Amino acid sequence: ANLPTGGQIVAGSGSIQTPSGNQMNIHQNSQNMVANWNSFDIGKGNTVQFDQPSSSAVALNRVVGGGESQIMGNLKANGQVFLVNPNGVLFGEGASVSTSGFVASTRDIKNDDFMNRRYTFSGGQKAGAAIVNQGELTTNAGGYIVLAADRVSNSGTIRTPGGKTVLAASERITLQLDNGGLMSVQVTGDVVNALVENRGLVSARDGQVYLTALGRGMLMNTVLNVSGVVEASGMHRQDGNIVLDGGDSGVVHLSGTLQADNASGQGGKVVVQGKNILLDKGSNITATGGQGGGEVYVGGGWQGKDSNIRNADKVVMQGGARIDVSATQQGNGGTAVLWSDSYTNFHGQIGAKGGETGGNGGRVETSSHGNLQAFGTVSASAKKGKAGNWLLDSADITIVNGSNVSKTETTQSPPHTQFAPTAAGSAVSNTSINNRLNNGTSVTILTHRTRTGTAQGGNITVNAAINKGNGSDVNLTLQAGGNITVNNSITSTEGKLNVNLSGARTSNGSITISNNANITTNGGDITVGTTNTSNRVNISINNTTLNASNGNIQLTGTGTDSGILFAGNNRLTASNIALTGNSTSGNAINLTGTATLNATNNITLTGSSTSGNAINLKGNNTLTASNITLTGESTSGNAINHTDTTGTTTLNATNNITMQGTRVQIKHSNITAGNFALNATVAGSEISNTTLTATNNINLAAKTNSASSGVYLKDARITSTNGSITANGTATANGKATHLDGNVTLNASNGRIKLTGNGHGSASGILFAGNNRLTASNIALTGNSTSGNAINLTGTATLNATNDITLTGSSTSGNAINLTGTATLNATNNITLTGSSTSGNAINLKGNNTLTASNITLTGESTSGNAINLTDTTGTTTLNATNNITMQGTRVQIKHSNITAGNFALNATVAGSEISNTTLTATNNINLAAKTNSASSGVYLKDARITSTNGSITANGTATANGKATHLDGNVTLNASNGRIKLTGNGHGSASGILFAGNNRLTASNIALTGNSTSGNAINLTGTATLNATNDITLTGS
Amino acid sequence: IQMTQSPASLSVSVGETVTITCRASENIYSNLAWLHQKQGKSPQLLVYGATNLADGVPSRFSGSGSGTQYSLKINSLQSEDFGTYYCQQFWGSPYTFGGGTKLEIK
């Protein structure tokens, strides 16, 4: 037998006895005792038994000579034992230590610190000393085992149920104890060739295991090597159930099975940290549990932001390595993180599954601030709950086809060559992503620009196709720090794939979906913008199809030369298509190629450009939707537009099209809408070379604050099948409120045509130039002006109304109604012309104007000019009414006209009326009434041909000043063979009554001349006159 | 803890997906492994921890189950998949085994 020898008690109190060669008994009296030994050896079959007053009592055995402590037999105590040997300690096979706590250390402790319960172990070791545990070291529940040495090796089994196991290589280790247990351990100080190796079984169920190795050198040598089994099952301790700490040097190599599972509760937390962490082929860090998973951190916390975990410089996880934080029955998946600052090599399998009977999938991060190689397998699916997320995070990510990337792991790979990267760029296998989408795991890819001077920028480049042929609905998000160049398609043949190709919150790059890289979601959404963050990320799409199926499409971006630029032959199919963007110099939305946008419900185009256009559609853009809305703003340019000398813009909205902006210039367009409407707010609107047909009402509103016209229609065909066409132009400068030119046809046979033009100053209201053909049930023209004219028809126009035609307006200095060109106003029922002027005329008909109707009504007022003026020496005015014609105003002058009427009557109230060089034939009466308050004549006829086929001719002139009440001159013929001719002339002062000059032939059944005068002649016959009557001729007056 | 599995023997077609079930006499917290013993060979591990497959096992095998009721689903069964499958629990000391199930060619 071989028991310790040379024992001497140096502090505290207790006796040493050896009752048998095979049994030693150390009896402790004090709470803390320290004894020195010449050698502390225990032979096979021998026992050293401590007898301490309590489980909290501590016996220190300091070896002061001999060699290493050969412990081969059984060592037992009811309290804590601290063994210190500067020559290291060896526990052989079959040895057993059972105490209330046990510490083995090659570092010495001072008697003053031990006796005063200050358990600090530092220095004094022999170089190369090691503690090797080949036996079974156990404690009572709540105890602890600490092995402190330059080299620590565990080949046997260590058990500290409910307590702590600490294996550490450092210059100083401080143990903070309280009431019999271990509260904390402070491990500090690098040593030369530090190594902590675990080959056997370490178990601390419901406790903690700490493995710490602090090396001074070991550039690429192993400092922490775990090849056996570490068990720390139980509750989720927030400080970590298993903690591996490789220090600030060397490589940590784990080949055994870290575990912290909880069969009935939540899984625990396993933290593996060090400079270089290598997970070998058979490793399986597992932190699972019954009611939900735990957490596994390798090299860092989530995204490296957890301040309590040292970030690794390199993490390599070889193929075959498995990390599982999945839930096993019911509960959410846990968190797994692979983090490195320089290089992450991920080829293994990480699970974070939800429970089979409930719970959501967990989250797995595989990332590196530097070079991330993500080729392995991640599974964070759920059987009943939500899909989990696989997060990738690296400087610049490139997606490649397959795994054939000359990876290094087990073939042609000498130990530790895996930490020398050659695969520049964060290559990601497309197979892994596709496998994640098919297995119910979402994928989120992030990048981030590094310091100025490097190449990596966050440019996510897709060089391999992504597809989702199977599995439940998952999301795919690619949020780059730099560019989102997509060179391959992203498709889905099953489930919903939600694609989010957003930019980083502060990104300043571009998103390009180049070379036939069509995106199809099979019902998921396509988002290539942000939402509300003002992230100046532009979108450039070339020859790409975006097919959302029954999902939504939303594109946003802001740039300088373009916001969202489309080129090539693009196609967009969705339930909702929303394109929003911004620019400063160029076009916010710029569609230059051929594009088909086919929405089931709505299409919305929104944008803003300070100096350019908001929405610019020049290529062959075809937009089909239930509702199409085009809205935008521009200060110096256009809001909307469809201009292009070769392209045609086709819009098809089954319910309504509404367009808004500062200026909308529609053109070479073909627009079909239910209720079509425009609202231009700053520089008017223009419809040129287009065809616009609507089932229901068309409402075109525009305001112009500059030289351009408000509602400008050129070569446009506007039709309303069952509704009305209403235009409302406003001009605040000198442009025209409403302006028609070219070949324009307006058809509202089932509705109304209402054109409004409100101008200001010299601006005119509604101008009709060229050739304007308007057909409707009801036609109405309304307008206002100040110095210009309100309604001015100068070209050729045809108006065909199935009921009435109404022309109304007001012009302060111009004419209210002005017809100087050639026109045929044809109405089935009534034509009414009403307006007002101050200096100009109310109605001025100058060109060849034919008005045909059942009833024609002409009315207006002019303060200084004429009320009704039908005069020109070149043109002829033709009127054709079936029923009554009434002409009422301050002054009515009719010259060079041919009027056919049922009844006809004049009512002049201020300056009388004149008919000259005209033919007027009525079936019934021609009652001409006129009052004059000036020197002008009341009723004056010059070279007039007036005939009543079946009626009478009546005139009643009044002269309140000194003008002629009634006056005839020229060649006048009055024919009333079926009636009476009655002329009344009531003058005042020096004025005469009825004056007959020239040659006046009056033919009637009865003729009567009645009048009154004061100083003048009541009847004054100065020329030639013949009065032919079949019965009586009466001449009376005073 | 007793383990029962069934069917004891299944006559299946090549290319058919089949299910083998296993029931524990006590609640086993997912610590159920499945072994595959090809005729003439020692049993090999296919799925460990109820659902996690062992490396080298084709994706056609899928484990499932919880509580006391577990099963193994074999998609598009191939010729190499015939033989005897076993379930075993590590939640009890006797790491008991089921009686085994055999797949034979129909």
Next chain:
Amino acid sequence: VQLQQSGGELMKPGASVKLSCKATGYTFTGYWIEWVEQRPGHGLEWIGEILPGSGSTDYNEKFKGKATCSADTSSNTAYMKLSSLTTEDSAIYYCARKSPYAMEYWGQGTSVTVSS
């Protein structure tokens, strides 16, 4: 990782045997080597477990006393002794490396036949 086993044996009733299962390609002391009996009509039954490093063992209650497990860590091989073998103890005995989850890499098994 490989777990080769000794070959079969023919024994007379009442004899004891000590079998063999070489462990290679992994840390021998870090995994448990479990011995399982396979018999026709019975399938597989667990026999016992040894942790070669510390020498800790665990046995099926029906096999206590009859079987003893041990290991030689220096030689990286696992031994099992079966006492007082009878006719009803003929079986194929497998050794396997067991990690916390699943007795992986089973060996080929030793056929132990007991007859007069």
